[PDB]
Amino acid sequence: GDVTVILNNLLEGYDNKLRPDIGVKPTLIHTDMYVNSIGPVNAINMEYTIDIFFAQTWYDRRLKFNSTIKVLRLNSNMVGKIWIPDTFFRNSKKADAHWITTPNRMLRIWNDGRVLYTLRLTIDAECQLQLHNFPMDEHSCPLEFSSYGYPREEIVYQWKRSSVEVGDTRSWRLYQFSFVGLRNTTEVVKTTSGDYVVMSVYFDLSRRMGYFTIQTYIPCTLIVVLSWVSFWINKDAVPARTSLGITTVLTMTTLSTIARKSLPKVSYVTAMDLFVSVCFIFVFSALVEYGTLHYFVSNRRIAKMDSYARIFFPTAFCLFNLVYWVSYLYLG
Amino acid sequence: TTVFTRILDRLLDGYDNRLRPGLGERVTEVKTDIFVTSFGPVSDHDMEYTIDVFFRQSWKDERLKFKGPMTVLRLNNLMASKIWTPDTFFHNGKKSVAHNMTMPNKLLRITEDGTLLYTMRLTVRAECPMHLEDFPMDAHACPLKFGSYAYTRAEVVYEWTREPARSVVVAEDGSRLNQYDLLGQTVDSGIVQSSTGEYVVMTTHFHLKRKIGYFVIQTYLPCIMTVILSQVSFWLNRESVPARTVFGVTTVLTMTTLSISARNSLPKVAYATAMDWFIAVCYAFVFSALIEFATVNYFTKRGYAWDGKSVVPEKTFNSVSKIDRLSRIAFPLLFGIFNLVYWATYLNR
Amino acid sequence: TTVFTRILDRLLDGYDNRLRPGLGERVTEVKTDIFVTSFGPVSDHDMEYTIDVFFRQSWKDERLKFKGPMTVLRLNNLMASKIWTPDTFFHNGKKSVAHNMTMPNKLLRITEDGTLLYTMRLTVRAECPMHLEDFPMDAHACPLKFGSYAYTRAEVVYEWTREPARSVVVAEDGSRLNQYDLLGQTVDSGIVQSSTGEYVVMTTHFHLKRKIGYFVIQTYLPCIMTVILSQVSFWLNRESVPARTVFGVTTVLTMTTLSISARNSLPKVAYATAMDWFIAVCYAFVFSALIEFATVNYFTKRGYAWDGKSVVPEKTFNSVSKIDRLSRIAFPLLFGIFNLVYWATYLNR
Amino acid sequence: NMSFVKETVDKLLKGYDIRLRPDFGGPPVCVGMNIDIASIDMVSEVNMDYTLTMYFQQYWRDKRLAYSGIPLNLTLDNRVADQLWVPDTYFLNDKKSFVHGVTVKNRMIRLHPDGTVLYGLRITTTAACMMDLRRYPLDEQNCTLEIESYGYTTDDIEFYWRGGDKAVTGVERIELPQFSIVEHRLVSRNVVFATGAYPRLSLSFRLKRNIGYFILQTYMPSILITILSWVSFWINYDASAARVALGITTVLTMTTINTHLRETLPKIPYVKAIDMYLMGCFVFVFLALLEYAFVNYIFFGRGPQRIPDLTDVNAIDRWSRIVFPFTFSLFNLVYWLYYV
Amino acid sequence: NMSFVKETVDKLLKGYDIRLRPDFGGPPVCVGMNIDIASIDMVSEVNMDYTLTMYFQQYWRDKRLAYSGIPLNLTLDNRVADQLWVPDTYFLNDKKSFVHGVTVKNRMIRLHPDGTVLYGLRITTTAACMMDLRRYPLDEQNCTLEIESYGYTTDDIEFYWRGGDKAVTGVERIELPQFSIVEHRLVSRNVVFATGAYPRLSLSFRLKRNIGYFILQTYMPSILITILSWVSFWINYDASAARVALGITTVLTMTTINTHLRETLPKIPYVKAIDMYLMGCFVFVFLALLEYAFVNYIFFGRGPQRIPDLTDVNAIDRWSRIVFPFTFSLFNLVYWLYYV
Ligand SMILES: *[C@@H]1O[C@H](CO)[C@@H](O[C@@H]2O[C@H](CO)[C@@H](O[C@@H]3O[C@H](CO[C@H]4O[C@H](CO[C@H]5O[C@H](CO)[C@@H](O)[C@H](O)[C@@H]5O[C@H]5O[C@H](CO)[C@@H](O)[C@H](O)[C@@H]5O)[C@@H](O)[C@H](O[C@H]5O[C@H](CO)[C@@H](O)[C@H](O)[C@@H]5O)[C@@H]4O)[C@@H](O)[C@H](O[C@H]4O[C@H](CO)[C@@H](O)[C@H](O)[C@@H]4O[C@@H]4O[C@H](CO)[C@@H](O)[C@H](O)[C@@H]4O[C@@H]4O[C@H](CO)[C@@H](O)[C@H](O)[C@@H]4O)[C@@H]3O)[C@H](O)[C@H]2NC(C)=O)[C@H](O)[C@H]1NC(C)=O
Ligand SMILES: *[C@@H]1O[C@H](CO)[C@@H](O[C@@H]2O[C@H](CO)[C@@H](O[C@@H]3O[C@H](CO[C@H]4O[C@H](CO)[C@@H](O)[C@H](O[C@H]5O[C@H](CO)[C@@H](O)[C@H](O)[C@@H]5O)[C@@H]4O)[C@@H](O)[C@H](O[C@H]4O[C@H](CO)[C@@H](O)[C@H](O)[C@@H]4O)[C@@H]3O)[C@H](O)[C@H]2NC(C)=O)[C@H](O)[C@H]1NC(C)=O
Ligand SMILES: CCCCCCCC(=O)OC[C@H](COP(=O)(O)O[C@@H]1[C@H](O)[C@H](O)[C@@H](OP(=O)(O)O)[C@H](OP(=O)(O)O)[C@H]1O)OC(=O)CCCCCCC
Ligand SMILES: CCCCCCCC(=O)OC[C@H](COP(=O)(O)O[C@@H]1[C@H](O)[C@H](O)[C@@H](OP(=O)(O)O)[C@H](OP(=O)(O)O)[C@H]1O)OC(=O)CCCCCCC
Ligand SMILES: *[C@@H]1O[C@H](CO)[C@@H](O[C@@H]2O[C@H](CO)[C@@H](O)[C@H](O)[C@H]2NC(C)=O)[C@H](O)[C@H]1NC(C)=O
Ligand SMILES: CCCCCCCCCC
Ligand SMILES: CCCCCCCCCC
Ligand SMILES: [Cl-]
């Protein structure tokens, strides 16, 4: 009854084609974001999924009303009846609002004309990853949003006190990454259609090491140690040490292709590539070590090369591991 | 015929579907029940599950009372878009589907007292966080939470139609699970607090236990057979260096392929699972059996084996290694003990 | 400005787009032609293919005659939804897209006599049933049938705009085939029967021949080299038992991997393709080489090979196996003869 | 004459209430159904579903649509279906479906003078059918389509197959690469939920899997590797490097055969018929290798210290040359007789 | 203020005919276009396409939308684009595309006092380019984006790049993990079809594939395996098991290297530059294994009967120690000069 009359009075003569204060001042929009979950990080596509409750608040003097009712708590029905900012996410690869069982949107109008607009979003956001330190890499994946058509002279966004909120991180789908922290910034980006106020959230992410230690580092280390068993086998066992030497190289070839299967086909050398390549050099050199020993003893000090290899090979791999892990875990 | 057209016209004449029933006067109470027509597959990679439901909602709306030759109007689902319905959404819902074939899979029924029945057929994809430390002997409680998106608990409250246990019903033949068992469901309700107010949330937890049969056949048995195969080389003579080297290297490489192929089903989690520990210990047993032979070969003096016609005076011939003799007992015993400890650790818990 | 607005308003005033032109007077005759902008990839596994077309239709509507400053009204696509258009659909289509980026890719043109031209950009995914007995040296005629969905041949008939061979035109640069050659298209017309009457069907068959280049590189050449590799062991001395056994076993393992991996992109058909026959015979040649050595090894009297010093009359030494000497000729000859028969059989089909 | 048709159709839809079924408040409206199956494909054991494309026709009578003076069956533009009441038909086991929309929505409306409506739709549906894979790949599957009214109970609507057993056509022309349709069956019953009893039509197909693919892919490679492992029994006991390498690789090769087969099937918690064969063939290659280790141990372990004799290695090898081929054929005899 | 603006905008749309283009029945309307590229991703050789995100802006003058008294460029809510004529621009090679719709449809309409309309869209399009992979992975592709009017011919509409060479921005900020964008250029031309001549704008990029990824994954593993097959040349000819195991493993390893690369590419019928190298490395490791068989046959097959000597077994091994590293270096010298 009375609420129907108020709603009809607000929309009588209302033109939702016009931004509030269209020729007076810019529209100030206060934005909030509640992160329900930061989904998986897709390194191959350089993207991540984030589920947010995106809240916007502005003032529309055309929506003022006087009554005992201090606020109109409404569903999504009136969202298309009033003016709504054309907020979009600038690095969104693919985004979708939710529609089950109804459009997950909220509209609340106060008697002073203040409008609160909230909706639930899932966003596949672009995040360019520098994988040089992979799998010990750290990233700060952004999430930028602005107005699509209204420049800085027409729409201005502004972070509130509790800008970005994150819930129970333990329920998130960050399998290989840990959420470290977030920052929210404001800037003006100049395009060809004008200057736009762009709001960004950066999510710092550190890769968890455990998966690639199990998947690659431990298998590659064991094949390197496997190649050292040849050094303690009698040099007269030509088929035994040749088969042992060549199968480790074959296995190290198989591990190399598996290691990069989870990455984009970047053309620089990651920390994973360096470890695999050095492990390739160790298994390669062990077979060459026996070939030299076999040639100089049978197919003929050099004869004592096995005793040297029993120490030099384990010490060089320990030394390389000490340098490799220190440089990539504490250095640059 | 026109009698019912005038009733429907009168119901919508002056009706405002922007306003909930009892607005400014009371709290809209929505009765809810779920009929699970199928419990779809659980996706380990996405940590989510699929579920096809009849999502039934019921509430009172005095604006839709009528008097006519019928007590219930069983109307086309086109009518539901003209009236206020609850804005229920799934809190942990991912991309869900409202079925539209061949028509919107919704029903609306209006009784003469104003009570509304509003059910829809939905394919719901909901997040199910998983702790895979016990995989493949893990169990999960996959939640399904829903409530009003826009109306706080002072405006819309949800209740179950019947006793909470009997308000979520699963069809007898609806199980679409392949590697899980539906032990049962727990039904509850509560309040969720946000920055925009307090909201009623309705919760259902489905309890799923993974079935280990697939992983026994494809992972555990090949691992166990590989470890048994690696201990075969203990019984060969110490002079069969190429033969006993092929035993050790092939089984080590086989365990390497098994370990890498084992996690292809799982999401790339950063912790070790129960299967990873079994494979790691199997790797240690296989690796040690090759390391055992290297120690045996280090103490092998002569390059020729016993010719079969000479008595060893305990030319001369190498003796049977004491390391080989002890490994014939120690390795099967330790691996048998590990299996006892491993299975009792996880099957009992 | 207002001159052309008044014309369009007059045309649509009292116009019923539920009624086909000539309903109750004659048959609506629709002239059709197709411009193929790209013949997209063929999917063997789904037995389908993709095609991108400018699908053009033309019919007469006496309700749309006009007189004005222009003889042809080139209007945007939203006028097409205001008038009657044919309900053409593709009989063998699976999931077709009518592109609407950035606007509906449709054009409507009305001439003063009432003739309408109505073209749309479509991406049709159509069924192409395949017989893969001759794979990978097979050829297929992929059909593209279309016609009215609801109107029978007593109400709507379709005809080609020009000579039927010239009414389906493929662009010179429009070829997205990777492993097929488009050799041409045959264009025909016919009548189909259903439960609701007789319908005109317009048919196009696209004649595709598979390009064998990929499968020569990835399957045929590795198989031929494995067979040649397996016969290398015939030239090794009969006392190299570990060496010649590794030759036989590894080549069999390689042939097993090749045989299993060679049907990855094909539908799981119940018959044998030409590739499956080639791999079977290659497997038999590889398998029989290891059987050949086992026969040779069964008559090796001594475990030691020739020392390089002692004369061999005709201590004692084994002689070169007669089975080996015949195998050094028979095996290469029988595989060469099989290839001559195999390639003459299928490259001539 | 064309103006008379336009006037007649306008008269039908004037005052028509799309919210009300025919005979609203009266006897249930009877809906007759026919299906012309265009194709069945994508029968997935991984997803436990099949994809079905069909021409789906519904046949009911709406007395509000009766017209006189026109001795014709009015075929109207399919957009008129949005101005008429149509049954709320849905498929219960439908996972993902769509009405084709090229070039227009593949939908037919044909009115008849007495008020009969023919409503046709070209539908591609991916319906669910759980498959018992215990006898896979020598299994028969039964996959159904459950047709039901969503909002109307048996008091408001009744389904029936129009034409009896001839309601569904085109089944005999369906060609599946991996299946042959043994038969199809039409069922009409009622299903009760908490909201009432609803009419249901069930169309079911019995699918028998062709085994010709699996002979080439799994069975024959497994048989040949098992036969290959018997070659060791003709090699001398002292050739340890040869017999171990032959025995080890065949054991390894069996895993390679199994993993490829595993990758193309769902996570099944029970043993399939194909699993029994692979595990049977793995035992034979494993025992053939264990046979040599026993032979090697007898000669080199128990030699210096001084059913076959179990003391002569030649006897054990010659015993193996007979028992191993004989037992494997016995296993194949029992296996193939039980699953055929 | 706001009353006048609302009065003005309502005046523009009153009597506006969206069915008629600007200057309908008169001169062609000139439409200028600017593109700001957000990113390029999913450059797929398997699917022969690339995915492009861009801000697609169109510039034209509609004198029916001229307004006076308001010294402002009116940015209206993007739903007004449904009430205005806009060019029916389409992308000929566009396989799949969408306008982003979060939080609203990513669309902009900005009016100007003289009647000029700025219409921007944020579009992600998967456009097809057929790639010539004969030099893969050292290939240089050229992927385009055809921009055309569908229903309006050059008599009705004209296209041009607004800003000439500056019409497309953001190309220098694109980071493709596998390619580097060497150059982009803009082309304007007309295309003739059976229905008329239509204006076409063409934007094309030249993508040069990076080689560093393939050095680590395909080239270095092949070189190391080829070098390790030469180790058998320093092994004693008596060690048949050692040299056959070394020879067989490298041949087997080369196949495994090729299968991993094979599975991530389309099924093109020609030989790629990577295939030429892998075939070359296969020949080298195959001939090394064949080198021992010749050595084995000379010592044992012809020894009792009784440029390298071809009768001295050790002479052949010495010859192979020099020729194989030399010829492989010659093969690498020719291969890399031809493709770099
Ligand atoms: C190329 O062509 C394609 C099509 O081939 C085209 O895509 C189409 O784009 C148009 C827009 O241009 C879409 O139309 C709008 O869609 C809006 C929502 O879109 C989202 O939801 C879609 C499904 O919606 C269903 O469910 C919701 C609730 O969950 C319901 O509101 C809808 O009506 C609809 O319900 C029907 O279907 C369900 C089953 O699905 C049934 O159960 C139900 O019974 C009913 O039959 C979904 O499909 C969309 O996904 C697409 O788009 C996303 C990107 O956004 C993409 O990621 C996906 O992949 C996919 O492509 C999407 O999620 C909808 O709100 C609009 O409806 C408005 O406006 C129309 C205007 O005519 C009006 O008629 C409606 O009543 C409604 O009025 C609004 O509603 C507002 C809701 O917030 C409200 O605030 C307003 O106040 C007003 O409310 C009403 O107003 C009326 C009038 O005053 C009043 O009487 C009422 O009482 C009430 O107050 C509109 O439908 C269309 O859906 C797209 N189709 C497809 C297949 O994608 C594409 O754009 C073209 N491209 C180009 C470049 O041209
Ligand atoms: C795939 O698997 C599915 C699921 O198992 C198979 O579907 C089943 O097919 C069989 C065979 O066609 C069905 O049995 C038949 O059902 C019909 C219909 O029954 C309904 O309508 C009757 C009136 O026409 C009505 O009387 C029935 O009610 C009685 O039965 C129900 C059963 O639960 C009972 O609850 C009631 O109290 C009644 O007693 C019911 O509403 C029926 O007409 C058939 O009767 C024939 O056979 C019986 C003997 O069985 C005989 O007495 C009759 O004279 C007549 O000859 C028959 O019962 C079954 O209903 C289907 N089940 C489902 C769930 O769909 C499907 O066939 C499989 N496919 C293939 C290809 O094999
Ligand atoms: C993981 C493996 C760790 C291995 C650790 C191995 C640690 C270690 O150093 O062992 C040496 C010894 C080797 O015994 P093994 O029987 O293998 O070797 C014999 C031994 O060396 C004799 O002393 C030799 O006789 P001799 O008098 O020289 O003439 C004999 O020569 P011959 O008879 O041919 O003429 C050799 O064959 O092993 C143990 O005593 C078992 C300890 C427990 C081993 C427990 C192993 C689990
Ligand atoms: C798959 C082929 C299966 C063939 C099965 C063939 C089964 C079969 O009967 O083999 C016997 C014989 C073995 O030939 P092979 O040369 O290997 O064996 C020699 C033969 O046994 C001589 O008789 C021995 O001399 P002796 O007199 O004892 O002093 C000689 O001893 P030694 O000189 O070494 O000390 C042996 O080496 O082969 C054929 O005659 C070729 C048949 C056609 C072969 C056709 C092959 C295509
Ligand atoms: C997000 O932005 C808000 C401002 O919108 C930041 O809050 C400000 O923090 C500074 C700290 O020196 C205070 O002086 C301001 O008064 C704060 N503004 C408020 C509360 O409105 C907040 O720190 C930002 N979050 C980041 C950068 O992580
Ligand atoms: C070409 C690589 C050869 C490796 C073995 C060399 C053995 C002899 C060294 C003098
Ligand atoms: C790292 C490989 C070790 C193999 C056994 C060595 C035993 C040495 C005993 C002195
Ligand atoms: Cl193709």
Which chain B residues are Cβ-neighbours of A210 within 8 angstroms?
269-272
Q: What is the DSSP letter of E305?
A: T
Any residues with Cβ below 6 Å from ligand 7, and which? A 228-229, 232; B 291, 294-295, 298
Q: Looking at the DSSP assignment, which residues form a beta bridge with residue E111?
A: E117
The CA–CA distances, whole Å, from B107 to B120, D82, D125, D150, D242 equal 7, 18, 22, 7, 74
Residues in chain C whose C lies over 2.5 Å from the next residue's N (breaks after): 314
Residue at token pair 């021992």: E292
Q: Which residues, numbered 319 to 338 in chain C, qualify as contacts with chain D under a Cβ-Cβ cut-off of 8 Å?
A: none
The CA–CA distances, whole Å, from B342 to A120, B211, B330 equal 45, 17, 18
C23 touching chain E per CB within 8 A: no
- Assign residue E33 a region: left if phi > 0, alpha if psi is -120 to 50, beta otherwise? beta
Tokens matching residue E5: 């603006």
| Ligand 7 mutation pick, B295, B297, B322, B323, max ligand atoms within 8 A of CB | B295
Any residues with Cβ below 6 Å from ligand 2, and which? D 142, 144, 183, 185, 187, 189-190, 202, 204, 206
Cα–Cα dist A39/E179, whole Å: 28
| Dist. CA B291 → ligand 3 center (Å) | 14
| Ligand 3 mutation pick, B230, B244, B287, B299, max ligand atoms within 8 A of CB | B299
Do residues C147 and C202 lie in contact, with contact meaning Cβ atoms separated by under 8 Å? yes
In the three-class reduction of DSSP (H, G, I as helix; E, B as strand; rest coil), residue E5 is classed as helix
- Assign residue D338 a region: left if phi > 0, alpha if psi is -120 to 50, beta otherwise? alpha
Query: Where exactly are the structural domains of chain A?
Result: 2-208, 209-331
Whether residues B271 and A210 touch (CB distance < 8 A) is answered with yes
Cα–Cα dist D51/D45, whole Å: 12
> Which residue type occupies C4?
F
Cα–Cα dist D44/D264, whole Å: 10
Q: Choose, out of E57, E133, E248, E286, the residue to mutate when testing the contact with C (most C CBs < 10 Å).
A: E248
In the three-class reduction of DSSP (H, G, I as helix; E, B as strand; rest coil), residue D137 is classed as coil
CB of B320 sitting under 6 A from ligand 3:
no
> Smallest Cβ distance to C241: which of D39, D118, D235?
D235
Count of CB atoms within 10 A of residue D231's CB? 22
Which helix (H) or strand (E) segment is A58 a member of? Answer: strand A47-59
Q: What is the DSSP string of B47-110?
A: TEEEEEEEEEEEEE-GGG---SS-SEEEE-TTGGGGS----EEETTB-S-EE--SBS--EEEEE
Residue E26, classified by CB atoms within 10 Å of its CB into exposed (0-12), middle (13-18) or buried (19+), is exposed
Between CA C255 and CA C259, with CA C258 as vertex, the angle to 5 degrees is: 85
Count of CB atoms within 10 A of residue C330's CB? 14
Q: Which residues surround ligand 8, an ion (CB under 5 A)?
A: C 41-42, 177-180
Give me the half-sphere count of Cα atoms (radius 13 Å) on the Cβ side of residue C94. 20
> Smallest Cβ distance to D123: which of B35, B101, B179?
B101
Q: What is the DSSP string of C279-322?
A: HHHHHHHHHHHHHHHHHHHHT---SS---SSS-------PPPPH
Q: Which residue of D has its CA nearest to C96?
A: D102
Which helix (H) or strand (E) segment is A33 a member of? Answer: strand A27-42
Do residues B104 and B110 lie in contact, with contact meaning Cβ atoms separated by under 8 Å? no
Q: Looking at the DSSP assignment, which residues form a beta bridge with residue D94?
A: D127
Q: Which residue of A has its CA nearest to B123?
A: A100
Cα–Cα dist B146/B158, whole Å: 10
Q: What are phi and psi of A312, to 5 degrees?
A: -60, -45
Tokens matching residue C141: 């005629």
Which helix (H) or strand (E) segment is E181 a member of? Answer: strand E179-192
CB of A295 sitting under 6 A from ligand 1:
no
CB of A321 sitting under 6 A from ligand 5:
no
- Distance, first Cα to last Cα, chain E: 67
Radius of gyration of chain D (CA): 32
Which chain C residues are Cβ-neighbours of D38 within 8 angstroms?
91
Cα–Cα dist C87/C152, whole Å: 11
Whether residues D194 and B33 touch (CB distance < 8 A) is answered with yes
Cα–Cα dist B20/B156, whole Å: 9
Q: Is D119 annotated as a binding residue?
A: no
Alpha helices by DSSP H, listed for chain C, are 2-12, 213-215, 221-230, 241-261, 274-298, 322-346
Whether residues E9 and A46 touch (CB distance < 8 A) is answered with no
Which ligand places an atom closest to the C-alpha of E103?
1
Which chain D residues are Cβ-neighbours of C196 within 8 angstroms?
57, 108, 110, 118, 120
For this entry, resolution in Å reads 2.9
Q: What is the DSSP string of B132-158?
A: GGGTTS-EEEEEEEEEESS--TTTEEE
Which helix (H) or strand (E) segment is E212 a member of? Answer: helix E212-214
How many residues are listed for chain D in this entry? 340
Q: Which residue of D has its CA nearest to B247?
A: D248
Do residues C89 and D122 lie in contact, with contact meaning Cβ atoms separated by under 8 Å? yes
Which chain D residues are Cβ-neighbours of B119 within 8 angstroms?
195
Inter-helix orientation angle D220-229/D240-263, to 10°: 170
| Ligand 2 mutation pick, D139, D204, D205, max ligand atoms within 8 A of CB | D204
Do residues B28 and B157 lie in contact, with contact meaning Cβ atoms separated by under 8 Å? yes
**Nearest Cα to Cα of residue A52 among A241, A184, A176:** A184
Q: What is the DSSP letter of C102?
A: B
Q: Choose, out of E7, E77, E107, the residue to mutate when testing the contact with A (most A CBs < 10 Å).
A: E77
- Distance, first Cα to last Cα, chain A: 69
| Dist. CA A294 → ligand 7 center (Å) | 20
Residue at token pair 């026994």: B216
E55: domain range? 1-210
The CA–CA distances, whole Å, from D108 to C88, D75, D281, E61 equal 12, 8, 57, 43
Whether residues D252 and B254 touch (CB distance < 8 A) is answered with yes
B14 touching chain D per CB within 8 A: no
Q: % helix / strand / coil in chain E, to the nearest 5?
A: 40, 30, 30
Q: What are phi and psi of E312, to 5 degrees?
A: -95, 120
Tokens matching residue E63: 């004198």
Do residues A328 and A136 lie in contact, with contact meaning Cβ atoms separated by under 8 Å? yes
